[PDB]
Amino acid sequence: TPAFDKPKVELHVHLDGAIKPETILYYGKRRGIALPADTPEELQNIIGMDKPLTLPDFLAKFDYYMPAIAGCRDAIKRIAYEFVEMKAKDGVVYVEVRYSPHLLANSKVEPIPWNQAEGDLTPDEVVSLVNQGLQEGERDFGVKVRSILCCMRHQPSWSSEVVELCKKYREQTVVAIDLAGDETIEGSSLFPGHVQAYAEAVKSGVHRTVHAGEVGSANVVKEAVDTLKTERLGHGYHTLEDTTLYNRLRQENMHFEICPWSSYLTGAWKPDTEHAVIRFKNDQVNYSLNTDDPLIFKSTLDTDYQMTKKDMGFTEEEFKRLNINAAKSSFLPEDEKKELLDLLYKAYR
Ligand SMILES: C[C@H](O)[C@@H](CCc1cccc(Cl)c1Cl)n1cnc(C(N)=O)c1
Numbered sequence: 001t002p003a004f005d006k007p008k009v010e011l012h013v014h015l016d017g018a019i020k021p022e023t024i025l026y027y028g029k030r031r032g033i034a035l036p037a038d039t040p041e042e043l044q045n046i047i048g049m050d051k052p053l054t055l056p057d058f059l060a061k062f063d064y065y066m067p068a069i070a071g072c073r074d075a076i077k078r079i080a081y082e083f084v085e086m087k088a089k090d091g092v093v094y095v096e097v098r099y100s101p102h103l104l105a106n107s108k109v110e111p112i113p114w115n116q117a118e119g120d121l122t123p124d125e126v127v128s129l130v131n132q133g134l135q136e137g138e139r140d141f142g143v144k145v146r147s148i149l150c151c152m153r154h155q156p157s158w159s160s161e162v163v164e165l166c167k168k169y170r171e172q173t174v175v176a177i178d179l180a181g182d183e184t185i186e187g188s189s190l191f192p193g194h195v196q197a198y199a200e201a202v203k204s205g206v207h208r209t210v211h212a213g214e215v216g217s218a219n220v221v222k223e224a225v226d227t228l229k230t231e232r233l234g235h236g237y238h239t240l241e242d243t244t245l246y247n248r249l250r251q252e253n254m255h256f257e258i259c260p261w262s263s264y265l266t267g268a269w270k271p272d273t274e275h276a277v278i279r280f281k282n283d284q285v286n287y288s289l290n291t292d293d294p295l296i297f298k299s300t301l302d303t304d305y306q307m308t309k310k311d312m313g314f315t316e317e318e319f320k321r322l323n324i325n326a327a328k329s330s331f332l333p334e335d336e337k338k339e340l341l342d343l344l345y346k347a348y349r
């Protein structure tokens with residue numbers, strides 16, 4: 001089957017949408033919460049998607065399965081570990097894994113995510129546990145792993161704990177801040193909780209990505225560049241609808257975090273249209289191919305490669321380019337990014 005069985009890099013993927021059904025059923029039963037089914041399989045199909053789906057019909061998914069894990073130290077670390085193992089199985093050599101620490105917390109967070117009753121697991125201890133699991137992960141399956149903490153659109157009261165958390169735990173394993181959630185909250189990029197968070201990220205060399213352009217307009221991408229100052233964008237499709245902004249980001253060699261399967265699934269991309277990635281490819285963009293959420297999208301990395309191979313003419317050589325780029329566009333430190341590149345230059349020949 002495999003579409004490029006060469007090593008890859010991956011920059012854009014959510015931990016909380018990368019759990020095994022059966023680890024969820026496990027803490028489900030283990031921790032008396034009821035999941036809406038009782039085989040890992042009924043579950044998949046259920047948190048699984050095979051059509052677009054409304055912002056809420058899509059967020060409710062986080063309630064089928066997140067109260068199994070959040071709260072639970074052992075669970076959190078377990079998911080971090082088995083994410084890594086998951087990525088070894090796709091043939092990846094470097095992954096940047098992203099999440100919100102508040103969304104696995106049950107203490108020292110307002111408001112309490114997912115109906116949790118208040119407990120003791122805080123947003124700081126989530127980071128440690130995620131680290132513990134990601135590092136031990138790395139050691140066992142030999143994948144390189146960094147993490148990325150997400151800010152939430154709708155909750156810029158979190159944002160500075162986020163940067164702070166990012167600086168606290170830097171390369172041990174965190175590399176950057178993100179912006180995620182409902183990109184269609186109006187004004188949201190400029191919410192001063194977020195601006196100051198990114199600004200602070202700039203004060204103290206923390207790398208930046210932001211979700212934009214997947215659903216919200218080209219305006220949201222340019223607030224991402226100009227005001228939050230990102231180095232990378234997650235998605236950035238709608239970038240096309242402003243020629244000058246596309247132009248200048250092509251010229252700046254901005255990184256595009258592309259999630260092709262994800263976008264058909266979500267609705268973001270519709271199929272009587274030109275898929276945005278093909279454009280990128282035609283235009284020699286800096287972009288990577290990424291999976292977003294293996295859980296929700298019923299996917300693996302090779303899913304993504306299949307569609308562009310099989311649907312969009314992607315040749316192996318683009319594959320190569322795109323991985324080289326993503327490596328190039330890692331939030332790794334300089335010295336260790338060169339070493340990623342040596343690894344891929346050699347594997348690609
Ligand atoms: C970013 C974090 O790493 C979680 C957050 C999921 C979530 C939960 C509550 C409220 C909102 Cl709006 C969202 Cl998107 N995450 C997981 N998958 C996505 C996605 N594709 O948007 C976001």
Ligand SMILES: [Zn+2]
Pocket residue numbers: 012013014211234292
């Ligand atoms: Zn994402």
